[PDB]
Amino acid sequence: IGIPVFIGYTSSPVDKTAIKLHSLADFARSFPESGLMYYSVRHFFENGGQQAYVLSLGTEQQLSDFSSLITALQQAWLAQTIAAENDITLIITPDVIRFDQTEISDTQRDLWLQLWQSVLNLCKSRRGIMGLLDAPDDPTLAAKCLQQFSSADRQWGVVYWPLLKSAYQDNTQNPIVLSPTAAVAAVIQRNDNQQGVWTAPANIALSKVISPVRAYIEANALFNPDGTSLNLVRSFPGKGIRIWGCRTLENTHDSPWSYIQTRRLVSYIEAYMTQLGRAFVFEPNNAITWMKFKGQAHNWLRQLWLKGGLRGTQEDQAFEVLLGVDESMREADLRAGKMIIKIRLAVLIP
């Protein structure tokens, strides 16, 4: 399941390694209260979040500027830590709120793109890691950034907009503005447990949110049918705060990665197959091994199909596994010592 990690500056300095948190008591046991990322951590737990990680670049007081934050995110030790720590799946950086939106010039537009690229670089340490991104406050700059972003890692990026305000208050009576990334991350954990990974985390109610920091009408231009669209957090009349949108940063309309559930579902299937494949690393490459591998994979996929995870009326259209001296390799491949398994899948559409 998706285990998010929080990256930001923390009032209490700690080492360069992450920590394991299962409840707010453990968070308090390690960290002092009051702070932007602590409030979001509370928001994540209060929405139904079970467990998450926290990583600190430095102390809360050493915030300098946008370029300093990006440069700090580019340090090598962060990539190694998340790569080493296996069960991390989602990456959250709520500290981008602390910086004002002074102007809409090219200087600000480029910085937002590099933050997205730097996060996506951290997501490439291991396969299957999602990055949750933020957008500039006004729709004009966000639309400009969406169209002008150029990267080959658009598949792994999900962006949410606008910022959110919650009932939490500081010593002064001002509503705390929080990024919606913390809220959805709790929803994904709830969706993964109650409904599974293959269920889209959209059309679902949030909790303890007063109102979006901006309105609905101004967000019409951000969504786009073909590609480079956003995901909207939108209030509803008589239905509460809702999450409206489940699309990633993928551009091409034909790609199966255009939805967050499909890309995560494939990665979830990929992780299990890698785990199963490790038991066959040096097995004899003959018919007995092929039948054993085919049987286990077929049974697990059939189990997933009966939960509605795969699009199909019979088994054949749902999935197909090929493994043998033919239809998957040749005799020259056996002497090379490599085994080739081909798996075909049919994902759902929301």
Binding site: R127, H253, D254, V281, G337
Partner: protein, 348 residues
Amino acid sequence: TTITTYPGVYIEEDASLSLSVSSSATAVPVFAVAGDNPLISGKPYIRISNWLEYLTLKNEQFDPANTLDISLRAYFINGGGYCYLVQTTDLEKQVPKLDDVTLLVAAGENITTAVSTLCKPGKGLFAIFDGPTTELKSDGTSNSDYDPNPFAAVYYPWLTADWTTTIDIPPSAAIAGVYCSVDSTRGVWKAPANVPIQGGLQPKYPVTDDLQAQYNQGKALNMIRTFPKSGTLVWGARTLEDNDNWRYIPVRRLFNSAERDIKNAMSFAVFEPNSQPTWERVRSAVNNYLYSLWQQGGLAGNKPDDAYFVQIGKDITMTDDDIKQGKMIIKIGMAAVRPAEFIILQFT
């Protein structure tokens, strides 16, 4: 081709291209703005998504004396979407820079030079003109000023409303809104005629049945007329070219959308290998798009092979020297459906 170099488990993901055609928006207009207008001065273009948004960009109340305001509210009251504002002298530069632009709207000023240098085959643009402001001359020679361009249409007469005081609304502003409403409801192949004007607008002059019959040939003028039982309707859907290929607006606009859609889809298969597997994928993608059009009724024919054909191959469309020179050639035929402009009833 993964290089196996250490013992372990390797992961592959299919990267072969998946090709399909997606329908775009076929009603995005561009309005011409005079030079002296302060809103457009000092900027390349302005994108307006709502009538209230235009007022937000402005700082005054609604003005019935300026052509820009009445044209914009006439366009929005008839339905539509976002539109661009470009200076007349800058049309030749900004229009090619905007790939989403589909329609060019005169909006009450001379844009003849811009149309001739922009609306050309393969460009995907279409133009809407404004008819003469005076009485329609009886003998039918009030068409000489217009150039017989098959990518343009002229509408007559200018419209007036209750809020209008001394300047009449150019017809092209309202007609552009009608194009989007018809396209969204019935489709691009549907004729943008025999439909009401939603703004409660009235033509400045009445047009008799025989007078329209005089101007419905050659460089025709599509007419906005009032009918006793149907109110105000748009009558006539002819272009400025009278040949059988491009006599009607829907036929010309349908090809514009089909070319634009396939061209955008084909840009994802430019540097792909030029062999049989690629030809199978491009043929399937185009066949599905044309099959969808025939299902909706945009193409005429009892069976799909009577409505369209797609040819591509090593000996069908290109030769051996073409492949060695990096050319892939696709031939596409289409049988567009045409409006039933005249209905003839004969009894025995």
